Structures are given as structure tokens and as C-alpha cells.
Symmetry: C2
Subunit: 56 residues, 2 copies
């Protein structure tokens, strides 16, 4: 991979981790609708990360 | 807002910014399918941030 692709892959992995950290924060606050949105977000983040891994 | 809600709101805003930064990285690499996924991701991130703002 190039250095620019490595950066992009690391960023997608970071976002994917961050959305799981926020999901647990929103579960601690019992913010139901926001946690449902956030779970979908983390799944969408994982889909991007895996797409980057396959391409790069 | 409580301090825990402020943290959660700041995290949602951070993710929303991060997905726009990655979108521009993926456009620079001409990674078409990944940028399309990432655009949708940033829209989904904005939807979570706005949902948090309205609740908190």
C-alpha cells in the first residue's frame, strides 16, 4: 500500500472504534433513539473500513 | 446539559468532522466506491449529531 492509503485505512479504523465508544456513552445515558442511530453508524463505519481494507 | 451529555455531544461532532476529513482523503485517492460509502457515512454522522443536539 502507499503511505496515503495507509493513512486513509488508519482513519477508517479510528472512526469505526470511535463510533463504538460513543455507542457505549449513549447506552450509559439511556438515550435510546440516539444509541439506535449510533449502532447503525458503527455498522456503516465497519462497512467502510472493510471496503478500504479490500481495496488497499 | 450535564457534563456526560456534553461529552457525548462533543464526540458526535468530532465523528461528523472526521468522516468529512476522510471523505476528502478518499477523493484524493480516487477511490470511488469508498468515497460513496464515506459520503453516506458523513450524512449518517450528521443525523446522529443533530439528534443528540435536539435531545440534550
Amino acid at each position: 500500500m502507499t503511505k496515503q492509503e495507509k493513512t486513509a485505512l488508519n482513519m477508517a479504523r479510528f472512526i469505526r472504534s470511535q463510533t463504538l465508544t460513543l455507542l457505549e456513552k449513549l447506552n450509559e445515558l439511556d438515550a435510546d433513539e440516539q444509541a439506535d442511530i449510533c449502532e447503525s453508524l458503527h455498522d456503516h463505519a465497519d462497512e467502510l473500513y472493510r471496503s478500504c481494507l479490500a481495496r488497499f
